[PDB]
Amino acid sequence: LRNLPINQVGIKDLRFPITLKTAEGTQSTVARLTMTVYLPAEQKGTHMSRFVALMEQHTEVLDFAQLHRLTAEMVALLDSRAGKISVSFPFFRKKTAPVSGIRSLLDYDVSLTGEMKDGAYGHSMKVMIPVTSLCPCSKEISQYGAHNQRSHVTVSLTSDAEVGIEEVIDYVETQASCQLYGLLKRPDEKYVTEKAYENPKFVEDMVRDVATSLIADKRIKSFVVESENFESIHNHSAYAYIAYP
Amino acid sequence: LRNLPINQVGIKDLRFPITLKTAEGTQSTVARLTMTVYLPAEQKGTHMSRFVALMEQHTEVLDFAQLHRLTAEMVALLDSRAGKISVSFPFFRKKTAPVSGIRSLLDYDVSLTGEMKDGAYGHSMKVMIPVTSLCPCSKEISQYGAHNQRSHVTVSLTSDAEVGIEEVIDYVETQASCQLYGLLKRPDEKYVTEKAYENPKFVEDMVRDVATSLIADKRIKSFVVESENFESIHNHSAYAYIAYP
Amino acid sequence: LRNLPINQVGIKDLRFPITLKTAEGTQSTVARLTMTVYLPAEQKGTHMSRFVALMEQHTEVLDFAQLHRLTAEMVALLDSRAGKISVSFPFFRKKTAPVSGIRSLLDYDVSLTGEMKDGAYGHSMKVMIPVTSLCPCSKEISQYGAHNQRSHVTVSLTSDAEVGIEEVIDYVETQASCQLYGLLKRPDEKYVTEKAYENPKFVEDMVRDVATSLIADKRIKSFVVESENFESIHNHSAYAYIAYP
Amino acid sequence: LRNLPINQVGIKDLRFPITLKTAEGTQSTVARLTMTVYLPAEQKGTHMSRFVALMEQHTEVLDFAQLHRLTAEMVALLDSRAGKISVSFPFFRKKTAPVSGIRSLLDYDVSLTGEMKDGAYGHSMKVMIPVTSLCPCSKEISQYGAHNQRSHVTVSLTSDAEVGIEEVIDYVETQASCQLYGLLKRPDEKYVTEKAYENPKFVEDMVRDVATSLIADKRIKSFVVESENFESIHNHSAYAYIAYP
Ligand SMILES: Nc1nc2c([nH]c(=O)n2[C@@H]2O[C@H](COP(=O)(O)OP(=O)(O)OP(=O)(O)O)[C@@H](O)[C@H]2O)c(=O)[nH]1
Ligand SMILES: Nc1nc2c([nH]c(=O)n2[C@@H]2O[C@H](COP(=O)(O)OP(=O)(O)OP(=O)(O)O)[C@@H](O)[C@H]2O)c(=O)[nH]1
Ligand SMILES: [Zn+2]
Ligand SMILES: [Zn+2]
């Protein structure tokens, strides 16, 4: 009576090396794990060591399948009817060379969750994409030139089916006025202006475009899209988000 | 070209100094503000300048009523049906050492949110109370000693009636194995050490014990209680939360 | 023999409200304090409560004089021949209106140190200034428009004599292609492009210009100047610094 | 127009995945890189693209020698007399629980720096070891219990000879009231709790005890030892450092 069920309990912010397999190759990274389960009213404690125990044992590559695998095994190991694992980490993508084979690397911040309710599995995903946004109402008053600044686009979402980290990166960068590339001389600098100068976007635009994509994709049962446009003109961001449904 | 509502759009993390009135006095602090409005589909973009305007003008001491006032004035100006203000800040309170009674400030992190949805007002608040936790497992099994650590309890709740920040602080501080003070003399430090060793609590115990107090407060419609213990024997945290309902 | 003198010891990251007096008015803020003293080889411990004790007692406005005052009083209170106090906090500046009396606020991150060696006082200062830098080699390849991004300029320095937080802000913004103002319509936006478009600067330029000022000022016995130009084109900064002498 | 040398100029916080070789094995981690060169007075600007180039090309396991190799290759390419590379990263090591012997990784933060000054090479390294501290004052004065907390010991040193990261870890872990492990079973947790209560240490004691070990290592020319204890009875830290010489 006095004691209540605890929605979730376990470890949080355990920093752990993970080798990650996505559909454009395997890569090694450093993740930060949160791992928890439902604890019923009559049980005083969960078992804290078993969460770390699980991760130490499982040196298998982490993909969508392996994340289900761990999460079901977790509820198993700790004798609970529910629980979640989250894995946050930087994710790197190789961008092949638009000039002579000089291809740069770009870093993204990604976070995968896996959840077991009673036997039912559910997964969700969060990905932050840094982009170079350009303003179209700052080119409208100025005869020449415009207000350019770095902007971040986060995309949180839930699906029944597997959805690649990169598919989401791409969903976002497609709409990007111009995305972040690696330093290449004169050649790669000419067409970074013109792509963002004649089609520039606001914080409101960026969320709409990305949302439109996300509505289309029947796998995505729900999402949130945030864009943050760090005004160079003030020490504070322009911000907007959309949730669906 | 466009056909998508934006749930919220505005400025985020405007860092702004403020003067705050609470039951126990008035203080000067520094705040992060996020302020945003609903944006209808065919409307292309909100009016970013107007947020900042609103805040430069109002020099009024912040208080439950003032937040309401400010959030209704915000949807008015930017001409919108719904909107949100959130103000985050360190909050100070004067404490009394338990034996010697020497006075010292302790610091807390607060976030207060006002929301308007078609004339209706809601306010929620988040508060973070650092306290001490001491492990009952370590106490029991050991011929002496008990590992203890600083821990963050974070309460978020919603209410129609105003709940004082200090009120949420007392609910937590009371239940903590023991609480923190800036100033302690030998007898004080003797007191607190022994207090913790007498009243050990799992992360489960804290959130449970705090949740109950909250449930016993008719004003509170909903809450989350989190407790993170930065285990002094691990390099990760123990973590638990209860959500009501 | 086995035990050594400890250069410094005390409290670190004590978060405390301070009312700060500079030569353009008094303002209230929230500071983070580090406070320490030399501990000789024969002494096992310092006195940790006295650092907090001092701050609780002294509710006098903090200016250059008051910071000496505290620092000498500190070594006194804790019976040591040396020690330092540092105070970090955000500092706000009122920027009067270039159009009809609509004047915005901008936040800066400042940090003041005070040190007593044997009786000799020494002070130093650190100030981070956010600026809107524009590139002049990105306007050189493009016929119209250029690569604009937010950049941060930190200025650390030591003086015999008082040097105002604002004098340093100004030293930096003078050289600024354009500095951060508050949102004003059409009027204030026209001359934010032209000031940074015809005189744009790199990371190397910004450090040189600011250094030149700092060499001039006979009060400044030494400094460091850092500029960080967060490339919107990559998730990593362009960086440079100069130390003198 | 210009007449001022720049001590260092380059890119900062390039976030890059790496493979690292140490005495006890080879691991995959993620790194922040800062790379910079000396810039002579009348030379206007360094060549930012070339830093990134250098790193995309070299896929070699990182190791003491490789850092040297990389920093000499860097001044070569950018055509400069002096320069600095610094690589920061989480570092993992496999530990053995003290009683049960169960294996678990603990995580550390390392920063390795190479510097070239006119053909001469220097390397320094910084390392942060989380450990447990337990107060001897609290132990003494109290009829039972001792407040303890997690604490960060941070060692920075310079040497002509290579010092293994794990070597610096062992110097600290040994002196800690007790050390951390990811996995502990009851007997293990019993062990560590009791170990700390037996070997209590002021922040003064730790840095002192660790400093001595360092002094006893002819390879180390200079060092700083810091220890921050996140006091479980306060909301600020105790802090001390020794600098040699
Ligand atoms: N549930 C819980 N356990 C904790 C906390 N802090 C803490 O040190 N522990 C340690 O973790 C233990 C929980 O059980 P455990 O994971 O070691 O597993 P167990 O001994 O119950 O059985 P096992 O050997 O089958 O895993 C407690 O007995 C205690 O020693 C906490 O806040 N909550
Ligand atoms: N020096 C030191 N003191 C500590 C640490 N941790 C800690 O709790 N303390 C507490 O702080 C005390 C240091 O003295 P204090 O500031 O209370 O002053 P005091 O009792 O020596 O004399 P006072 O009453 O004249 O100030 C210790 O006795 C201890 O209870 C630490 O790491 N170093
Ligand atoms: Zn325990
Ligand atoms: Zn103590």
What is the C-alpha separation between D224 and D227, in angstroms, rounded?
10
Tokens 């896996």 belong to: A114
Note the helical H segments in B37-164: 48-57, 64-77, 136-141
Q: Give the single-character DSSP code of D191.
A: H
Distances from the Cα of D64 to the Cαs of A174, A199, C198, D14, D112, in angstroms?
A: 42, 48, 46, 20, 9
Cα four-point dihedral sign D86, D89, D94, D98: positive
Contact by Cβ (8 Å): D4, C242: yes
**Cβ neighbours, 10 Å, residue B143:** 8
Q: Which of residues 40-69 of C touch A (CB under 8 A)?
A: none
Could you give the CA distance from residue D192 to residue C243 in angstroms, rounded to a whole number? 47
Task: Kindly list the partner chains of chain B, i.e. chains with 3 or more CB atom pairs below 8 Å.
Answer: A, C, D
> Which residue owns the Cα nearest ligand 2 atom 23?
C47
Q: Which of C223, C191, C214 is nearest to C99 (CA)?
A: C191
CA A152 remoteness from chain centre: 11
Q: Answer whether C201 contacts ligand 2 (Cβ < 6 A).
A: no
Contact C197, C221 (CB under 8 A): no
* Structure token digits, residue B109: 């992190």
**C57 touches C105 (CB < 8 A):** no
Tell me the longest C-alpha to C-alpha distance in chain D: 73
Report the distance separating Cα C106 and Cα C91, nearest Å: 8
User: Is residue B125 helix, strand or coil?
Assistant: strand
Beta bridge partners of D202: none
B228 interface with A at CB cutoff 8 Å: yes
Q: Which residues neighbour A144 within 8 Å (Cβ) at sequence distance 6 or greater?
A: C144, C145, C197
Ligand 2 pocket test target in D131, D135, D206 with most atoms within 8 Å of CB: D135
What experimental approach yielded this model? X-ray
The length of chain B, given as a count of residues = 245
Q: Which two tokens stand for residue B167?
A: 């009120």
Which of D184, D194, D232 lies nearest to residue B132, judging by beta carbons? D232
Q: Are A120 and A113 in contact (CB under 8 A)?
A: no
Cα-based torsion angle of the residue sequence D174, D176, D182, D188 in order, rounded to the nearest 10 degrees: 80
Q: What value does the CA radius of gyration of chain D take, rounded to a whole number of Å?
A: 21
To the nearest 10 degrees (0 to 180), the angle between helices B165-175 and B203-215 is 140
C64-78 vs C49-57: helix crossing angle, rounded to 10: 140
Residues B239 and A52: their CA atoms lie apart, in Å, by: 14
Q: Is there an atom of ligand 1 within 6 Å of A48 CB? A: yes
Tokens at D20, concatenated:
């690292």
Strand partners, D28: D19
Which of the 8 DSSP states describes residue A48? S
Cβ–Cβ < 8 Å for B114, B158 = no
Q: Is A84 on the interface with C (CB under 8 A)?
A: no
User: Taking the mean position of all CA atoms in its chain, how far away is CA A1?
Assistant: 40
Whole-number Å distance between alpha carbons of C27 and C89: 12
Question: Would you report the helix, strand and coil content of chain B in percent, each value rounded to 5?
Answer: 25, 45, 30
Decide: A103 and A95 in contact? Cβ < 8 Å: yes
Retrieve residue D3's tokens: 């007449």
Considering every ligand atom shown, identify the ligand nearest to the alpha carbon of residue A53 and give its number: 1
> CA dist D171 to D107, D128, D165, D230, Å?
16, 12, 10, 21
Q: For domain C1-245, is the CATH number 3.10.270.10?
A: yes
**β-strand partners of A132:** A150, A178
Distance from CA of A184 to the nearest CA of D (A): 7
Torsion-angle region of B13 (φ positive above 0: left; ψ -120 to 50: alpha; else: beta): left
Alpha helices in A150-221 (DSSP H): 165-175, 187-197, 203-216
Q: Which of B24, B87, C140 is nearest to A193 (CA)?
A: C140
Measure the CA–CA gap between C175 and C189, rounded to whole angstroms.
Answer: 19
Cis peptide before B17 (omega within 30 of 0): no
Query: Cα–Cα distance between A159 and A223 in angstroms, integer?
Result: 9
Question: Three-class SS of residue C216?
Answer: helix
> Which residues of chain C are within 8 Å of residue D39 when distances are taken between CB atoms?
204, 240
Comparing CA positions, the residue from D34, D48, D40, D80 lying closest to residue C208 is D40
CA dist A158 → A89, B77, D175 (Å): 19, 36, 48
**Comparing C-alpha atoms, which of D28, D97, D22 is closest to residue D59?**
D28
Rounded distance between C-alpha atoms, residue A202 and residue C18, angstroms: 39
CA pair distance D146, D154, nearest whole angstrom: 24
Instruction: Give the rounded distance of the alpha carbon of C164 from its chain centre.
Output: 10
Alpha helix positions (H), chain C: 49-57, 64-78, 138-141, 165-175, 187-197, 203-216
CA distances from A119 to A72, A80, A81, A83 (A): 8, 11, 8, 10
Total Cβ atoms within 10 A of residue C45: 14
Tokens of A164: 């690649």
Amino acid at residue number C230: F
- Cβ–Cβ contact D184 with B under 8 A: yes
| Cis amide linkage into residue C90, ω under 30° from 0 | no
Mutate to test the pocket of ligand 1, among D180, D184, D189, D193 (most ligand atoms within 8 A of CB): D189
Other beta carbons within 10 Å of C213: 19
Compute the count of residue pairs across chains A and D with CB atoms less than 8 Å apart.
Answer: 58
Q: How many CA atoms lie within 13 A of B33 on its CB side?
A: 24
Start-end of H helices in D48-135: 48-57, 64-77
Cβ–Cβ under 8 Å, residues A45 and D181: no
For residue C84, count CB atoms less than 10 angstroms from its CB and return exposed for 0-12, middle for 13-18, buried for 19 or more.
buried
Q: Of the residues C3, C12, C48, which should be mutated to test ligand 2's pocket, given the most ligand atoms within 8 Å of the CB?
A: C48
Beta strands in chain C (DSSP E): 6-22, 25-39, 82-95, 104-117, 120-134, 148-159, 178-179, 220-230, 237-244
Distances (CA, A) of A227 to A170, B6, D207: 15, 11, 46
Ligand with minimal distance to C49 CA: 2
Q: Is residue B78 a contact partner of residue B41, using CB atoms and an 8 Å limit? A: no
Which residue bears the tokens 């390795």? Answer: D112
Q: In whole angstroms, what is the distance from residue D195 CA to residue D148 CA?
A: 12
Tell me which amino acid residue A156 is.
Answer: S
Nearest to D125 by CA among D28, D245, D221, D17: D221
C46 lines ligand 2 (CB under 6 A): yes
Q: Identify the bridge partners of residue B132 per DSSP, sorted by sequence position.
A: B150, B178
Q: Which residues contact C59 (CB under 8 A, 6 or more apart)?
A: none
What are the chain B neighbours of A208 within 8 Å (beta carbons)? 2, 4, 6
Tokens for B86, please give them: 């959130």
Structure tokens at C105: 């606020």
- The identity of residue D106, as a single letter, is L
Question: What's the CA gap between C16 and C34, in Å, rounded?
Answer: 11
Distance, in Å, from the CA atom of B86 to the CA atom of B71, rounded to the nearest integer, reads 9
Neighbours of B58 (CB within 10 A): 12
Residue entry with tokens 């050594």: C4
Cβ–Cβ < 8 Å for D195, D177: yes
Gaps in chain A after residue (C–N beyond 2.5 Å): none
Dihedral sign for Cα atoms in the order B154, B159, B165, B166: negative
How far apart CA B227 and CA B241 sit, in angstroms, is 7
CB atoms within 10 A of CB A190: 11
Q: Which residues have CB under 8 Å from D13's CB, separation 6+? A: C236, C237, D32, D33, D34
What are phi and psi for residue C172, nearest 5 degrees?
Answer: -80, -40
- Two structure tokens written together for B202: 């799992």
Separation CA C81–CA C73 (nearest Å)? 11
Q: Please, what is the end-to-end C-alpha distance for chain B in angstroms?
A: 41
- Chains touching C by CB (3 or more pairs below 8 Å): A, B, D
D238 CB neighbour count, 10 Å cutoff: 25
Pinpoint the alpha helices (H) of C38-184: 49-57, 64-78, 138-141, 165-175
D24: burial class by Cβ within 10 Å (0-12, 13-18, 19+)? exposed
Nearest to A206 by CA among A167, A146, A151, A147: A151
Pick from D45, D47, D41: nearest CA to D2: D41
Give residue numbers after which chain D breaks (C–N above 2.5 Å).
none
First-last CA distance in chain A: 37
Q: Which of A74, A80, A83 is nearest to A42 (CA)?
A: A80
User: What is the Cα Rg of chain A in Å?
Assistant: 21
CA angle, C59 as apex, C58 and C64 as ends, to 5°?
80
Measured from the Cβ of residue B206, the count of other Cβ atoms closer than 10 Å reads 25
C-alpha span between D153 and B56 (Å, rounded): 44
